[PDB]
Scaffold this motif. Structure first.
Motif, PDB file in Angstrom:
ATOM      1  N   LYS A 135       0.832  -1.194   0.000  1.00  0.00           N
ATOM      2  CA  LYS A 135       0.000   0.000   0.000  1.00  0.00           C
ATOM      3  C   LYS A 135       0.871   1.249   0.000  1.00  0.00           C
ATOM      4  O   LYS A 135       1.824   1.355   0.776  1.00  0.00           O
ATOM      5  CB  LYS A 135      -0.921  -0.007   1.220  1.00  0.00           C
ATOM      6  N   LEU A 175      -9.409   6.006 -19.292  1.00  0.00           N
ATOM      7  CA  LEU A 175      -9.150   4.589 -19.482  1.00  0.00           C
ATOM      8  C   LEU A 175     -10.012   4.041 -20.614  1.00  0.00           C
ATOM      9  O   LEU A 175     -10.953   4.682 -21.084  1.00  0.00           O
ATOM     10  CB  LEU A 175      -9.425   3.810 -18.198  1.00  0.00           C
ATOM     11  N   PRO A 187     -17.871  -9.078 -13.509  1.00  0.00           N
ATOM     12  CA  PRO A 187     -18.791  -7.931 -13.459  1.00  0.00           C
ATOM     13  C   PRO A 187     -18.298  -6.766 -12.620  1.00  0.00           C
ATOM     14  O   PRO A 187     -18.532  -5.611 -12.992  1.00  0.00           O
ATOM     15  CB  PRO A 187     -20.072  -8.544 -12.881  1.00  0.00           C
ATOM     16  N   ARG A 188     -17.627  -7.022 -11.499  1.00  0.00           N
ATOM     17  CA  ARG A 188     -17.203  -5.954 -10.600  1.00  0.00           C
ATOM     18  C   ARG A 188     -15.717  -6.079 -10.306  1.00  0.00           C
ATOM     19  O   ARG A 188     -15.237  -7.164  -9.965  1.00  0.00           O
ATOM     20  CB  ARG A 188     -18.007  -5.976  -9.296  1.00  0.00           C
ATOM     21  N   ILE A 189     -14.992  -4.968 -10.446  1.00  0.00           N
ATOM     22  CA  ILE A 189     -13.563  -4.910 -10.175  1.00  0.00           C
ATOM     23  C   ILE A 189     -13.267  -3.656  -9.365  1.00  0.00           C
ATOM     24  O   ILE A 189     -14.026  -2.685  -9.377  1.00  0.00           O
ATOM     25  CB  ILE A 189     -12.719  -4.925 -11.468  1.00  0.00           C
ATOM     26  N   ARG A 190     -12.144  -3.687  -8.652  1.00  0.00           N
ATOM     27  CA  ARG A 190     -11.687  -2.556  -7.859  1.00  0.00           C
ATOM     28  C   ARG A 190     -10.427  -1.963  -8.472  1.00  0.00           C
ATOM     29  O   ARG A 190      -9.706  -2.626  -9.221  1.00  0.00           O
ATOM     30  CB  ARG A 190     -11.411  -2.965  -6.411  1.00  0.00           C
ATOM     31  N   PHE A 191     -10.161  -0.704  -8.137  1.00  0.00           N
ATOM     32  CA  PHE A 191      -9.026   0.020  -8.690  1.00  0.00           C
ATOM     33  C   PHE A 191      -8.165   0.591  -7.574  1.00  0.00           C
ATOM     34  O   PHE A 191      -8.678   1.076  -6.561  1.00  0.00           O
ATOM     35  CB  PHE A 191      -9.486   1.147  -9.613  1.00  0.00           C
ATOM     36  N   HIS A 192      -6.850   0.529  -7.772  1.00  0.00           N
ATOM     37  CA  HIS A 192      -5.870   1.093  -6.858  1.00  0.00           C
ATOM     38  C   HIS A 192      -4.931   2.003  -7.635  1.00  0.00           C
ATOM     39  O   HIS A 192      -4.547   1.690  -8.767  1.00  0.00           O
ATOM     40  CB  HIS A 192      -5.066  -0.001  -6.155  1.00  0.00           C
ATOM     41  N   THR A 193      -4.565   3.129  -7.023  1.00  0.00           N
ATOM     42  CA  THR A 193      -3.691   4.095  -7.678  1.00  0.00           C
ATOM     43  C   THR A 193      -2.444   4.374  -6.846  1.00  0.00           C
ATOM     44  O   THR A 193      -1.371   4.636  -7.400  1.00  0.00           O
ATOM     45  CB  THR A 193      -4.443   5.398  -7.956  1.00  0.00           C
ATOM     46  N   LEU A 241     -15.511  -7.290 -18.760  1.00  0.00           N
ATOM     47  CA  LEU A 241     -16.599  -7.032 -17.824  1.00  0.00           C
ATOM     48  C   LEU A 241     -17.672  -8.108 -17.896  1.00  0.00           C
ATOM     49  O   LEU A 241     -18.349  -8.375 -16.898  1.00  0.00           O
ATOM     50  CB  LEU A 241     -17.210  -5.660 -18.098  1.00  0.00           C
ATOM     51  N   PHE A 267      -2.309   2.615 -12.426  1.00  0.00           N
ATOM     52  CA  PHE A 267      -3.630   2.113 -12.079  1.00  0.00           C
ATOM     53  C   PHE A 267      -3.630   0.595 -12.147  1.00  0.00           C
ATOM     54  O   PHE A 267      -3.207   0.014 -13.154  1.00  0.00           O
ATOM     55  CB  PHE A 267      -4.693   2.688 -13.016  1.00  0.00           C
ATOM     56  N   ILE A 299     -11.716   0.142 -21.379  1.00  0.00           N
ATOM     57  CA  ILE A 299     -11.913  -1.246 -20.985  1.00  0.00           C
ATOM     58  C   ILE A 299     -12.276  -2.055 -22.220  1.00  0.00           C
ATOM     59  O   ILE A 299     -12.931  -1.561 -23.145  1.00  0.00           O
ATOM     60  CB  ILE A 299     -12.994  -1.374 -19.893  1.00  0.00           C
TER      61      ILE A 299
END
Lengths: 175, 344, 439, 433, 175
Positions: free
Chosen positions: D134, D180, D191-197, D187, D157, D182
């Motif tokens: 993190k 972005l 169906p659902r994804i998370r994003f980290h920067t 998808l 990302f 996709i």
């Protein structure tokens, strides 16, 4: 019934959940809070456990004229397993659960609910050619019942008919 | 539970590789991977696990070096034991694994010391491949061909749980040009019937789905009951997943015949007279229900008198089964011992 | 101090032309679904959830709507929900409706807003409490709370036209981007989102729109300042584009154990009917008879079979599953009906096969016919030796001659063929009446 | 055998420009022992006993028999004519590679348990497994980079599945303009994804031999961190029959082994594969997994701020991993043993005068200080010379620096063996030495 | 069999006296000397206490071809009551008690002794008109037996036939 007897003697209780809507969990918790040994076990292992049981005590929803039972789902298999070992069966029910009807209509006898309880909606296209059935109540013949405990005493299943004759006039059987 | 306190209880969140050295150890890496997969529960099935174990054993036999003076015949037998003790620690074994163990040990002992290392390695690999090819696939094909003759147009077949052999038989029969429909019954510690439901729907077969407690509601329509098995006992009883005996009893009560399909290499020699004692327990935390706000049994260890039970196996007497189909044909249930082990 | 009683706004006008071989005769809200008028489901749902006052707006063919509503059970003095009818000929879109609502000053607190075609059994107490707490802790920051249902992206109730994709803040449910997915193969998201939070952004494509929202009075004002807004999508997009100040944020609530859907074309109509037959929406099954009508009663049997009163059946007929029969229907001998809905008072000959079909009231079908996936309107008639291929539509009073075989997609109507010529024997056969509306 | 560890040391990595004070990085001993020690040390703790190191001759000096530890390094002296990345650096050493590799750079001060990453590698039969942490806030005293003038950094990302185990998307802001894009087919399966920067890479890649085999056939790739991993994560989703011989024989060609799904026609998926659909791993052969660490110690030595941020906390870790090395050494002669902090390291041959006001600071070998010294939040080593009256507060000293009387320096680092006049200081080095 | 297992676990044993010879007292005493709980009761109370029994273990005098038993007098009823509760029954016997006979004629099956054991001789007034019968052995059908334990292992009653075919030549069945 069990709480009153637990004050003087000691025993062990086994509770089987009914799993379209698990409700035996609350019963087991309440029994454990009073200080009684309890065990929770799923419906699949009713037959394998019967060899170590001494008595069966159950409630009911309605009592029919000839002594048949309208119970929750899964009671028929329990009664069959108990009969296989000749274990006695006891029903605890008051007097306002007796009705002057015979098992001849069927159809609306059971009560069906949404199939959402069994198969989740998130299964996709598979929910386009599959039929799901979710009954609630079940019928039990009177040959599998041994005793009736009421607010007046204990009676054999054959006595119930006489009770009806002193409760309802035959004219008002059909409204 | 003091009634079943004899059997051990194990959890599936106890990592065993924390204290093991990273770049290989006494335990061969293949067994480490296989035990990790077994513990994580990624490989389930009475027959896939045997194949995976045999493949790992082939891999280990490939990489071996004879001691300078010691003959390999006893060296390999002595070396194999800790690996499979570790595997037993990971998860209890099954009958097929034990039979494979016995066969492999017999083959290892039977080798002669005059031959070289390479010849022995090649012979062992060939023997293992022959065993896998002969005792699984051809038996399944023969069983399916035998069972094709008891399916007719307009029938309704009832199945329980998940089994590869039953799905193969049904799909082959449907492809052969027969028309019927299927009913699936599921229990609720695992929900394993959804795999069969998906396979049958994809194959193009009508189907219905329901839970076990409602079994007495649909039995008036059913005409046949088809079941698999995990092991065959010496007296003729059948060991399978929990709940099979209930289905057998209710089907007997409604006058419905019951058929059982199994392979000949799962024949044990134990004797059992009740559906108790020798079984396997599982994690008691999976019984927790997730129904909105109401979540009972949470932190159930707080209450002193509360116990949760989780059985895995159940034995069925031979008085509730009417037919048994093996690669050698169809026989009554009570005649299992007189043919299966009479060749000895 | 308790809040004022809940109030609802109903829009009973389609403002579209996606149902126009038929809507010339009857308005959309009066179409018969499962032998029940389509406007009853919405009123029943609104009464059940706890609404104590309802407004209704009608513009097109308002006379028939008024006639139907005056005989309903929701206009009786004993009902707990009061129905008020407001009609005008100047309505063109939802924007005009909301501008008129703001001008007349009807709603005074949080309220509901719905169209006339919504089928659901959703209780909205939790969502209302969440909205009230959100608008109490802060000051006029949230002005809407949209509603979605969790579902897979492959369900047969997801039309290509209605699919949407959303961007969600994980901690507190807040919509940051909402986009349609019609005619696209790649989706784009502006970078300015990610500079806001760190690990709260989620992309969701597993939501189904129910077209149910909880609105505050401020929304009305935002529909008068911006004279160009005409639908809800324009409002949402404009709010999500202009992030300067005032009435900014929008929130979403997702359910998982209930039902909710809207009817906008034939495909979703068929899907919704099939879902209703199979007890998927059950506080409300055909046996319930929530309309309190004396002519709509039935008995339930095995394999999901519902039978009305007095219905007669011949010898050798077989009904497979998921069948509804209205009162007065007569059926001949050696038939085969599956997954069908039949209206009241229909006559059917012998050796007839019906599969995933839909017949309305007073329809006669001759013997020896085969029909698949078609809709028939009032007082239609079919002669002998007729085969209708999938996706066929017949409007009112249309008659089709014998010894014909229509292709897929055929549409026949008695109205002018394309808006005085004799009926073509090649189109509608001998003694036929109608014009091919192929387009 | 399972793994063949590789620890390259060609320079300090790939970003040498922002941090080069006086000496080559791989042999830099700041923190008492040299940095290249701590990676090797952890490899000794897990059980590894062979490490292959690729470096230049000048760093290799005295390294042949510096220690007699359990490892037997096979050091290969790369030519020093050019400084090129890791791609063909791995190609040069290909003939000495036999099994799966564990590439590790000589920058980590990590304290993570390696068992988790290898467990992920073993269980899922993955083709790649990374380690990231993190993104922690860089809150610390200013490293004196003119006190101001901090530029912007191109963010990265990472789009990860909800369970946080499988990598699905990863990109950098440099090539992206404003948004972005996709694929759209992704998808439909996730169906659902998370994003980290905000994240930090650890450079602890685990690779299979087929990756090296594919890499050897294409010299276009120059850096694994910037060209190989994005290519792998992009290709993992492209179907074998997708729409945009003699195509460099893409990774799918160099696959001659099975997975947890391809065993037999019986092993086709009717609960033979988790009970899911039959076609899930039949064609999908490239799979990637990442383990994300929330808290702990993991960073790369590439910034001036880290040069003191790490050393401010390495005494605790060193005492944790070494219970027989007290901060003070035997060859330390301290006149005032009452003003010494607990984490005050002192090396051999260290002469200490009166008023030894030392705390939260590191003292090296052959050190010389005199009376009236107060050194706090500092580190210095390598034969320094200090006279009476020097007050030090965060003034790093490299080597051979002479301090005059009354020289009170605050947070200014000095090196290059340069003397310092009396009553002279600044916020930072400015001219260092 | 009981003494071997008594070295590890603890259990309770009930013994019937088996009148009129009453040889159950000897086994009761012998098992009491080894340190096991025991209880002695008459024949007539077999059915009254069967509801609290987990297993029944017995011996035999002969084993016939089809799995039938020739045992002591009181065995047959003991076999029936157990079947009323589905309680398993176990027979312990070696392999030299197996005979290639069938239950065709029962004239030589039972064994009769003097009536002295039942009615004493001191009742001479009425002994001239009363007939007394004292059988010794007793027949038991094969449907009431669960398992056979011998020096080989456990077997079902159906397997017995096979053993016969590998023990005696068919010629020498009748001497």
């Amino acid at each position: 019934f069990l709480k009153e007897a637990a004050r003087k003697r000691k025993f062990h209780v086994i509770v089987a959940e009914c799993a379209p809507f698990c409700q035996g969990h609350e019963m087991a918790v309440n029994l454990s809070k009073a200080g009684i040994e309890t065990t929770v076990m799923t419906d699949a292992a009713i037959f394998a456990v019967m060899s170590r049981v001494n008595k069966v005590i159950i409630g009911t929803k309605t009592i029919l004229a000839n002594g048949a039972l309208r119970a929750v789902t899964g009671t028929h298999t329990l009664a069959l397993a108990a009969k296989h070992h000749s274990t006695p069966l006891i029903v605890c029910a008051p007097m306002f659960k007796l009705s002057p009807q015979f098992p001849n209509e069927e159809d609306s006898f059971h009560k069906f609910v949404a199939p959402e309880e069994v198969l989740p909606f998130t299964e996709g296209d598979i929910l386009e050619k599959v039929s799901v059935h979710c009954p609630v109540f079940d019928y039990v013949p009177p040959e599998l019942i041994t005793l009736f405990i009421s607010n007046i005493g204990g009676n054999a299943p054959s006595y119930i008919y006489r009770l009806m004759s002193e409760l309802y006039h035959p004219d008002d059987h059909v409204l | 539970v003091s009634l079943f306190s004899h059997l051990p209880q194990y959890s599936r969140q106890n990592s065993l590789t924390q204290f093991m050295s990273i770049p290989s150890s006494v335990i061969h890496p293949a067994m480490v991977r296989l035990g990790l997969q077994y513990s994580q529960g990624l490989v389930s099935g009475s027959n896939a696990r045997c194949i995976a174990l045999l493949r790992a054993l082939q891999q280990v036999i490939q990489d071996y070096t004879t001691p300078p003076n010691e003959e390999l015949s006893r060296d390999l037998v002595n070396k194999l034991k800790p690996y499979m003790s570790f595997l037993t620690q990971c998860r209890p074994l099954s009958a097929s694994m034990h039979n494979a163990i016995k066969f492999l040990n017999k083959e290892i002992t039977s080798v002669g010391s005059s031959k070289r290392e390479e010849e022995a390695k090649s012979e062992l690999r060939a023997a293992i491949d022959r065993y896998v090819q002969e005792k699984i696939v051809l038996a399944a094909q023969a069983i399916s061909r035998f069972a094709y003759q008891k399916i007719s147009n307009g029938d309704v077949i009832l199945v329980y749980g998940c089994s590869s052999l039953v799905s193969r038989i049904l799909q082959e029969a449907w492809t052969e040009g027969r028309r019927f429909r299927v009913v699936v019954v599921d229990s609720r510690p695992w929900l394993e019937g959804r795999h069969t439901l998906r396979s049958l729907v994809h194959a193009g077969v009508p189907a219905s789905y329901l839970l076990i407690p409602a079994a007495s509601y649909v039995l008036p329509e059913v005409s046949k009951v088809l079941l698999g098995a995990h092991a065959l006992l010496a007296n003729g009883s059948v060991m399978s997943r929990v709940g099979t005996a209930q289905l057998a009893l209710v089907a007997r009560a409604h006058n419905v015949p019951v058929l059982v399909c199994c392979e000949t290499y799962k024949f044990c020699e134990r004797v059992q007279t009740d559906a108790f004692v020798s079984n396997e327990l599982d994690d008691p935390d999976d019984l927790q229900c997730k129904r909105g706000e109401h979540v009972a049994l949470a932190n159930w260890q707080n209450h002193a008198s509360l116990r949760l039970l989780n059985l895995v196996y159940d034995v069925t007497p031979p008085e509730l089964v009417d037919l048994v189909i093996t690669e050698l044909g169809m026989i009554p249930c009570s005649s299992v011992p007189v043919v299966l082990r009479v060749k000895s | 101090e308790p809040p004022p009683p809940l109030q609802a706004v109903l829009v009973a006008d389609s403002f579209d032309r996606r149902f126009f071989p038929i809507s010339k005769d009857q308005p959309r809200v009066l179409l018969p679904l499962a032998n029940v008028a389509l406007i009853d489901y919405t009123l029943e749902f609104l009464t059940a959830t706890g609404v104590q006052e309802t407004f209704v707006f009608c513009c097109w063919k308002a006379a028939q709507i008024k006639e139907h509503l005056l005989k309903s059970k929701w206009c009786r003095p004993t009902s707990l929900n009061v129905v008020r009818i407001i009609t005008s000929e100047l309505y063109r879109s939802l924007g005009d409706v909301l501008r008129d609502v703001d001008a007349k000053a009807l709603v005074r607190s949080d309220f509901l807003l719905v169209y006339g075609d919504v089928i659901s059994n959703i209780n909205i107490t939790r969502a209302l409490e969440e909205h009230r707490l959100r608008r109490k802790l802060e000051k006029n920051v949230s002005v809407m709370t949209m509603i979605f249902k969790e579902s897979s992206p492959s369900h047969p109730t997801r039309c290509h036209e209605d699919n949407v994709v959303v961007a969600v803040d994980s901690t507190t449910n807040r919509v940051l981007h909402f986009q349609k997915t019609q005619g696209l193969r790649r989706f784009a998201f502006p970078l300015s989102l990610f500079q806001g939070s760190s690990d709260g952004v989620e992309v969701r494509y597993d939501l189904l729109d129910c077209h149910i929202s909880i609105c505050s009075p401020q929304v009305a004002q935002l529909f008068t300042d911006n004279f160009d807004y005409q639908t809800r999508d324009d409002f949402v997009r404009g709010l999500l584009v202009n992030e300067e100040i005032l009435g900014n944020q929008i929130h979403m609530h997702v359910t998982a154990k209930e039902y909710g859907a809207r009817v906008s074309n034939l495909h979703m109509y068929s899907a919704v009917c099939a879902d209703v037959i199979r007890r998927w929406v059950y506080p409300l099954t055909p046996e319930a008879n929530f309309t309190d009508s004396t002519t709509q009663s039935c008995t339930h049997s095995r394999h999901n079979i519902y039978r009305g009163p007095e219905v007669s059946l011949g010898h050798g007929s077989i009904l497979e599953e998921n069948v509804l029969l209205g009162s007065g229907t007569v059926i001949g001998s050696n038939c085969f009906i599956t997954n069908s809905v039949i209206g009241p008072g229909c006559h059917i000959g012998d050796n007839v096969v019906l599969d995933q079909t839909y017949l309305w009231q007073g329809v006669r079908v001759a013997a020896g016919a085969q029909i698949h996936q078609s809709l028939l309107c009032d007082n239609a008639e079919v002669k002998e030796r007729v085969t209708l291929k999938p996706r066929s539509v017949l409007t009112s009073q249309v008659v089709v001659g014998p010894n014909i075989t229509l292709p897929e997609g055929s549409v026949i109507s008695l109205h002018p063929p394309d808006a005085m010529k004799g009926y073509n024997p090649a189109e509608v056969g001998a003694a036929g009446k109608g014009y091919l509306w192929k387009a | 055998m399972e793994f063949q560890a590789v620890v390259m040391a060609v320079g300090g990595g790939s970003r040498m420009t922002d941090l080069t004070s006086s000496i080559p990085k791989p042999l830099l001993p700041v923190g008492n022992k040299p940095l290249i020690w701590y990676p090797l040390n952890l490899l000794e703790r897990v059980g590894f006993e062979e490490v292959i190191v690729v470096t230049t001759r000048d760093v290799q000096k005295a390294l042949c028999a510096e220690f007699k530890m359990k490892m037997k390094p096979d050091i290969v002296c790369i030519p020093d004519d050019a400084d090129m990345g890791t791609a063909d650096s791995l190609r040069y050493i290909y003939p000495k590679l036999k099994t799966d590799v564990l590439v590790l750079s000589c920058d980590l001060i990590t304290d993570v348990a390696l068992h988790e990453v290898v467990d992920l590698f073993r269980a899922y039969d993955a083709s790649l497994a990374m380690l990231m942490r993190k993104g922690q806030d860089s809150i610390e005293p200013v490293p004196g980079q003119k006190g101001k003038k901090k530029a912007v950094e191109q963010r990265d990302f990472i789009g990860v599945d909800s369970t946080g185990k499988r990598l699905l998307f990863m990109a950098n802001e440099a090539d992206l303009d404003e948004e972005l894009v996709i694929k759209g087919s992704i998808l439909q399966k996730h169906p659902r994804i998370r994003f980290h920067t905000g994240l930090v890479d650890a450079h602890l890649y685990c690779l299979k031999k087929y990756i090296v085999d594919f890499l050897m056939e294409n010299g276009s790739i120059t850096s694994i961190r910037s060209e190989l991993i994005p290519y792998l994560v992009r290709k993992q989703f492209s179907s074998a029959s997708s729409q945009q011989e003699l195509k460099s024989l893409d990774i799918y060609s160099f696959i001659k082994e099975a997975n947890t799904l391809n065993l037999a026609p019986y092993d086709a998926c009717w609960n033979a594969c988790r009970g899911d659909r039959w076609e899930d791993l039949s064609r999908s052969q490239v799979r990637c997994y990442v383990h994300i660490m929330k808290e702990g110690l993991c960073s790369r030595v590439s910034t001036l701020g880290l040069y003191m941020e790490a050393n401010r906390q390495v005494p605790k870790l060193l005492s944790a991993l070494c219970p027989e090395e007290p901060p003070v050494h035997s060859s330390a002669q301290i006149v005032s043993k009452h003003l010494v902090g607990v984490d005050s390291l002192i090396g051999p041959e260290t002469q200490i005068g009166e008023k030894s006001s030392i705390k939260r600071s590191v003292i090296g070998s052959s050190c010389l200080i005199k009376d009236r010294v107060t050194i706090t939040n500092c580190l210095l080593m390598n034969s320094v010379t200090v006279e009476e009256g020097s007050n030090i507060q965060g003034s790093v000293i490299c080597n051979n620096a002479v301090i005059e009387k009354g020289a009170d320096i605050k947070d200014c680092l000095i090196g290059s063996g340069q003397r310092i006049e009396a009553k002279a200081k600044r916020v930072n080095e400015v001219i260092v030495g």
